[PDB]
Design a protein around this ligand. Structure first.
Ligand SMILES: *[C@@H]1O[C@H](CO)[C@@H](O[C@@H]2O[C@H](CO)[C@@H](O[C@@H]3O[C@H](CO)[C@@H](O)[C@H](O)[C@H]3NC(C)=O)[C@H](O)[C@H]2NC(C)=O)[C@H](O)[C@H]1NC(C)=O
Lengths: 96, 93
């Protein structure tokens, strides 16, 4: 009984979230990419192996593979944008 | 071989590429052709003087090609552009 009464404000807050998802798609559509090491800034250079320094120490290097990977919550399409905006609206992990 | 504390091969010349430099890139691969013509001269110099040690070309891209070929010696941090013999020849005091 209460669910059908609150169904008017559900149609509005879902329609309003979709427009913000589309705006986020327009703004950051494929801009959330990054390489494993913060020295290569495009997919071409982000290949092969690289030397990683643990916890900032220059005396403890380890060999790691650099991968050009996307973010977990991206704005590639209207669905990933809607899910990321839902996570933001839940106030969790939104500063990241 | 004697007078060489490792195992070597005179058939060709080895190529060293540092860990942080990706082999197969456009710059490296282009560098990896025209250095292959150095193997003939590497052989020719050794024939005149059999008592000849490593002959190495340190490329400005990062790769070092040396003759005779021998496997490289923890992790590897060797870079040919930081070696003392490369630095003295790339500039003046
Ligand atoms: C960079 O790599 C290229 C690919 O390996 C080399 O180009 C090929 O070199 C071959 C070896 O000389 C050529 O084969 C013969 O070349 C002679 C000279 O022109 C000719 O008799 C024929 O073209 C060919 N003989 C055949 C096919 O029976 C290739 O022609 C040549 N080009 C290709 C494969 O497109 C480059 O030589 C190399 N660069 C350097 C500086 O070594």
């Amino acid at each position: 009984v209460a669910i059908r009464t609150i169904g008017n404000i559900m149609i509005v807050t879902t329609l309003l979230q979709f427009m913000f998802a589309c705006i986020g798609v327009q703004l950051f559509k494929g801009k959330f990419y990054r390489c494993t090491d913060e020295a290569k800034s495009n997919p071409e250079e982000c290949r092969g192996l690289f030397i990683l320094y643990k916890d900032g120490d220059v005396d403890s290097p380890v060999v790691r593979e650099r991968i050009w990977q996307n973010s977990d919550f991206n704005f590639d399409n209207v669905l990933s944008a809607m899910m990321a905006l839902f996570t933001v609206s839940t106030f969790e992990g939104w500063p990241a | 071989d004697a007078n060489f504390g490792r195992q070597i091969s005179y058939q060709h010349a080895a190529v060293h590429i540092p860990t942080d430099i990706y082999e197969g890139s456009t710059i490296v691969l282009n560098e990896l052709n025209w250095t292959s013509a150095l193997d003939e001269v590497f052989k020719k110099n050794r024939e005149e003087d059999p008592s000849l040690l490593w002959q190495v070309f340190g490329s400005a891209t990062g790769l070092a090609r040396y003759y005779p070929a021998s496997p490289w010696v923890k992790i590897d941090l060797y870079d040919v552009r930081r070696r003392p013999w490369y630095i003295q020849g790339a500039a003046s005091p």
